[PDB]
Specification:
The complex is a heterodimer.
Chain A lengths: L13 E3 L2 E3 L5 E5 L5 H20 L6 E4 L4 H7 L7 H10 L1 E4 L13 H9 L1 E9 L15 E7 L9 E2 L5 H12 L13 E2 L5 H18 L3 E6 L8 H14 L4 E3 L2 E7 L6 E8 H10 L6 E4 L1 H15 L6 E6 L3 E5 L16 H13 L3 H16 L2 E2 L1 H4 L6 E2 L2 H10 L2
Parallel strand pairs in A: 3-4, 3-5, 5-16, 7-14, 10-13, 10-14, 17-18
Antiparallel strand pairs in A: 1-2, 6-7, 6-15, 8-9, 11-12, 12-13, 15-16
Helix pairs in contact in A: 1-10, 1-11, 1-13, 6-7, 8-9, 10-11, 11-13
Chain B lengths: L1 H25 L1 H6 L3 H12 L1 H17 L2 H11 L7 H15 L21 E4 L4 H11 L10 H15 L4 H4 L1 E11 L2 E10 L2 E11 L5 E3 L6 H7 L14 H8 L8 H8 L2 H17 L6 E2 L8 E5 L5 E6 L11 H13 L9 E10 L5 H10 L4 E4 L2 E11 L2 E2 H4 L5 H20 L2 E2 L8 E3 L5 E3 L6 E2 L4 E2 L24 E2 L5 H4 L5 H8 L6 H12 L18
Parallel strand pairs in B: 17-18
Antiparallel strand pairs in B: 1-2, 2-3, 3-4, 4-5, 6-7, 7-8, 8-11, 9-11, 10-11, 12-14, 13-16, 14-15
Classes of the chains: A alpha/beta, B alpha+beta.
Bound molecules: adenosine-5'-triphosphate, adenosine monophosphate and magnesium ion.
Adenosine monophosphate (AMP) binds next to helix 6, helix 13 and strand 9 of chain B.
Chain lengths: 415, 554
């Protein structure tokens, strides 16, 4: 059976009472990932270990345990075993894990492994922290003022995929029901008409806002901003705002600011105030270009979170070095967010920025905020110095070209 | 007084149906002569769907006549079966009527013919009295085919060259030939089927007659090995169009060749699929009585749409359609059945597995592994009902059990591995040329036969080659694109990208290079475009049920 060796001297991360007990000797599972995962994963392990050794003197150490998924999983488990049932089980059990890229499918017929892991492990939160790194090439004038954390709902909205083709009977049947049974007067063209359904629910909404407010508490963020299209879609996007504001009142004891919806929520640990605010989506996308500093932690629906994260990454020049995570009721999975770039795999050439920064997400999620900072210091140190991998080197001037492993060393040398 | 009427009404149905079956089969020569390959394809579909029209007709008749009992009829029907030449199929025909009348319920021995309950020569001998040079001339001349031959003497020169290599010039003078009276028709081939009677024993003798483009008929090869005939009459190949006024006599005759095939399988090959099914159940019941065994989940990778089980030592799998598919498979139950219907009508080219729809199939509770009972009860609850000591699976398929290509590849070294991947590519090529797109080319969806040939069995994602848009993967616009997780280009349903096939087909370090030397075309969109262009131009790719090397031309 199993071909994962559980490390002898490590110990399991435990969830009890809704709080994460992280032992000083934690076992962290890691998937190498397809293609360039082979170059970027070693680099991460070296840096994440280095940050822990320096920050905690050696009083802490991570027991790495390789689990499997994808092309490599084929090489150990058998021919067409791309996702072993134990991988899911080990991730559920050890609560926290990290992976390189898995092959995403072009073409509609085939099975995606990334989506398999998500829906399988029931990871309904897409977490995307965006900030600038001094020296990164950027299209904007002041990218340094951008330091946000996007809490994106991942189980509802138009992204659910509840849709019917035009002229499909099912569609005509659906349209029929709305038009005569529900009396819908606002479909301009009922013939040759596709239909999609947009569901937003209280239970689904509050998981996300709850998670985000906690994160603000845990990491000393200033505010949580609910982003929505309340002014047009009043019962989907508008309810998302209303429920989010209701949660901060009922569960976190938010006091009103000047009668306006805005709430002052008090951090239980520090005493410092966390502002709960809301802004319209189309406006927000302007507001992030013009005035990024105002914003901190952002909670929003599926479609909106996707749009905002893709725009924010562009502004800060970190499309190729964007960290990511997917969180559920019982575990968390930090991922590299780029593709597998099979073309380059094994040349130790690509930028490990993304996975390394998901490792910093991981470290902060373990409460080991100190060690996370040393990576941050390492990344901004090595970027400023212009000792970078090809993807940046070609764009910067007076830069030193380094291999993947080498850039990792540069990150370590600036800690 | 109806007792006899109903019984007579049913037998009238059988006489009717089999006569039509013979007529539809009689047109196999004229379809072949005129190269009407779309009618050849069409006749296969009609013969398959012929039996079911008459069963339906008889049932409606019986309903209009009838709008303990069944045993009166059963015995009446039994009484006119002696001195009736095709009693076996008549019993099966009887069964089909009861099964529709009672929606496949309460099927046991005395209510219907679940057990058997119970002239004109079909070949002629040929002896080399005046040498094989002339003997073969006489055989070829005795053929009713109304087209010309280019160099009969070439083909006759070939067949002796084979016969001399196969066995000694002393055995060949003492050996003789017993060829069957009819020609077995399939696709663009007319088959001569005979027996080779040697002092050392009796051997298969098979000559496929092919047709030059708007021209003569040539014998493409000569086959005399026990194992080669298996392939020709294979489960994965389409059924033969052969005129058989008495099939039971032909099944007995064919049995001397094809010694490994069961009665049912032998009936299948000639095109009596519904009777084959009756004999399939008896072969099942006989095996079941002969052993103490539990139904288990079949080896290999679990199904995301099909739940499949088997018996440890049994040569067939049972596939049932789950109540719920995996989240990523956006399919209706009706569509899978439609895919299965498609393959059953279609020409399989020895690359697709033959299935048998069974309604309300009965299993004993004690025969099921606890692991499977929970799996069946958990993933297929709607499909099953409880009957005390037994359960009823509403609907399942039965097909030949092979060994899954994903399993086989792990047990195979250098030389045999080279044979495996060759068989895969050729399988994919042959299927694509036969207007079929294999949805999940993944190895877990192909089986390996006793002969080492590769056959496809997942029909989750099947579709016609004419239905898909084959695309090249766009070159990157900017460097950024090389490292993105998602395409920047729009993708439609029906869009296929042969380039991406590499990731699932060339993961392993051994198999990749072999694909790269043997089947580079499978990963280029231009190859699938050329193929689909020919299917759109009406061209039908010839399939040889034999090695390409065996051909006379090489
Ligand atoms: N003819 C056969 N011989 C041996 N094993 C078989 C056969 N047919 C099916 N199986 C086994 O049953 C499994 C599931 O059946 P099948 O692959 O036909 O459909 P599926 O699994 O629903 O499709 P998918 O590959 O998309 O999940 C196979 O992976 C294999 O292990
Ligand atoms: N559920 C079943 N169990 C056993 N035999 C069956 C079942 N369904 C059909 N058959 C047999 O299969 C043959 C063809 O049946 P049908 O496909 O209904 O025409 C008949 O001889 C039937 O007796
Ligand atoms: Mg399968």
């Amino acid at each position: 059976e199993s071909k994962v060796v559980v490390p002898a001297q490590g110990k399991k991360i435990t969830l009890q009472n809704g709080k994460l007990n992280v032992p000083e000797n934690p076992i962290i599972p890691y998937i190498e990932g397809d293609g360039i995962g082979v170059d970027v994963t070693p680099a991460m392990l070296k840096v994440v270990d280095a940050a822990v050794e320096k920050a905690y003197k050696g009083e802490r150490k991570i027991s790495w345990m390789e689990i499997y998924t994808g092309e490599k999983s084929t090489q150990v488990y058998g021919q067409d075993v791309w996702l072993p049932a134990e991988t899911l089980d080990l991730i559920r059990e050890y609560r926290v894990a990290i992976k390189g890229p898995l092959t995403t499918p072009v073409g509609g017929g085939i099975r995606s492994l990334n989506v398999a892991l998500r829906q399988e492990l029931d990871l309904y939160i897409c977490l995307r922290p965006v900030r600038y790194y001094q020296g990164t090439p950027s299209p904007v004038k002041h990218p340094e003022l951008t330091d946000m954390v996007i809490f994106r709902e991942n189980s509802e909205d138009i992204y659910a995929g509840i849709e019917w083709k035009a002229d499909s009977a099912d569609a005509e049947k659906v349209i029929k029901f709305l038009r005569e049974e529900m009396g819908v007067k606002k479909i301009r063209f009922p013939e040759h008409c596709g239909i999609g359904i947009k569901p937003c629910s209280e239970e689904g909404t509050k998981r996300l806002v709850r998670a985000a407010i906690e994160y603000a508490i845990a990491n000393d963020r200033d505010s949580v901003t609910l982003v929505h299209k309340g002014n047009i879609m009043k019962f989907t996007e508008g309810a998302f705002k209303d429920w989010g504001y209701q949660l901060a009142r009922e569960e976190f004891g938010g006091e009103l600011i000047d009668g306006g919806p805005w709430l002052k929520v008090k951090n239980p640990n520090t005493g410092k105030e966390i502002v709960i605010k809301d802004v319209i989506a189309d406006a927000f996308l302007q507001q992030i270009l013009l005035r990024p500093a105002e914003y901190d932690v952002i909670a929003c629906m599926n479609l909106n979170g996707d749009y905002i994260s893709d725009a924010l990454a562009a502004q800060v020049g970190g499309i190729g070095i964007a960290p990511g995570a997917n969180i559920g009721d019982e575990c968390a999975l930090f991922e590299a967010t780029h593709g597998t770039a099979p073309k380059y795999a094994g040349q130790d050439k690509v930028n490990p920025g993304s996975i390394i920064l998901s490792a910093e997400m991981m470290l902060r999620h373990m409460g080991w905020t100190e060690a996370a900072d040393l990576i941050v210091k390492g990344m901004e140190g090595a970027i400023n110095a212009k000792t970078v991998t090809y993807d940046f080197e070609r764009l910067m001037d007076g830069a030193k070209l380094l291999k993947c492993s080498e850039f990792g060393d540069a990150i370590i040398e600036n800690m | 007084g109806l007792e006899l009427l109903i019984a007579q009404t049913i037998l009238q149905g059988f006489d009717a149906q089999y006569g039509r079956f013979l007529e539809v089969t009689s047109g196999a020569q004229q379809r072949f002569e005129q190269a009407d390959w779309h009618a050849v394809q069409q006749a296969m579909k009609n013969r398959i769907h012929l039996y079911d029209h008459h069963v339906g007709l008889v049932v409606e008749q019986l309903r209009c006549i009838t709008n303990e009992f069944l045993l009166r009829v059963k015995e009446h029907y039994t009484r006119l079966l002696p001195d009736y030449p095709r009693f076996e199929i008549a019993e099966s025909f009887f069964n089909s009527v009861y099964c529709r009348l009672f929606d496949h319920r309460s099927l046991t021995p005395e209510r219907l013919f679940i057990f058997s309950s119970q002239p004109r020569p079909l070949a002629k001998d040929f002896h080399p009295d005046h040498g094989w040079e002339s003997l073969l001339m006489r055989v070829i001349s005795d053929l009713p085919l109304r087209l010309h031959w280019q160099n009969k003497s070439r083909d006759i020169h070939y067949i002796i060259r084979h016969l001399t290599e196969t066995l000694g010039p002393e055995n060949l003078s003492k050996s003789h030939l017993q060829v069957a009276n009819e020609l077995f028709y399939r696709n663009k081939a007319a088959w001569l089927v005979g027996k080779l009677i040697t002092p050392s024993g009796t051997l298969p003798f098979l000559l496929p007659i092919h047709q030059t483009d708007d021209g003569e008929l040539f014998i493409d090869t000569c086959l005399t090995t026990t194992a080669e005939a298996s392939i020709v009459f294979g489960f994965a190949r389409s059924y033969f169009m052969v005129y058989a006024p008495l099939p039971a006599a032909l099944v007995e005759w064919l049995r001397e060749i094809l010694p490994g095939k069961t009665t049912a399988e032998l009936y299948m090959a000639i095109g009596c699929q519904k009777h084959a099914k009756t004999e399939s159940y008896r072969e099942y019941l006989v095996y079941l009585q002969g052993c103490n065994e539990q139904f288990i989940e079949a080896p290999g990778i679990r199904g995301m749409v099909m739940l499949v089980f088997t018996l440890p030592g049994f040569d067939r799998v049972f596939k049932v359609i789950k109540d719920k598919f995996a989240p990523q498979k956006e399919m209706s139950a009706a569509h899978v059945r439609a895919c299965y219907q498609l393959v059953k009508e279609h020409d399989r080219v020895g690359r697709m597995a033959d299935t048998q729809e069974f309604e309300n199939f009965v299993l004993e509770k004690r025969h099921i592994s606890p692991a499977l009972m929970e799996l069946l009860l958990q993933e297929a609850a709607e499909k099953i009902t409880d009957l005390g000591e037994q359960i009823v699976i509403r609907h399942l398929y039965i097909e030949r059990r092979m060994v899954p290509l994903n399993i086989w590849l792990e047990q195979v070294e250098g030389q045999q591995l080279r044979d495996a991947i060759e068989e895969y590519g050729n399988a994919i090529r042959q299927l694509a040329a036969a207007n079929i797109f294999p949805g999940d080319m993944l190895f877990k969806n192909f089986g390996v036969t006793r002969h080492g040939r590769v056959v496809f069995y997942d029909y989750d994602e099947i579709c016609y080659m004419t239905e898909v848009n084959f695309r090249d993967i766009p070159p990157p616009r900017y460097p950024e694109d090389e490292l993105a997780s998602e395409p920047w280009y729009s993708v439609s349903p029906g869009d296929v990208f042969p380039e991406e096939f590499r990731h699932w087909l060339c993961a392993d370090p051994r198999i990749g290079p072999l694909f790269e030397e043997m089947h580079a075309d499978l990963f280029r969109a231009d190859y699938w475009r050329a193929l689909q262009n020919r299917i759109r131009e009406g061209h039908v790719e010839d399939v040889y049920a034999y090695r390409r090397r065996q051909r006379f031309s090489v």
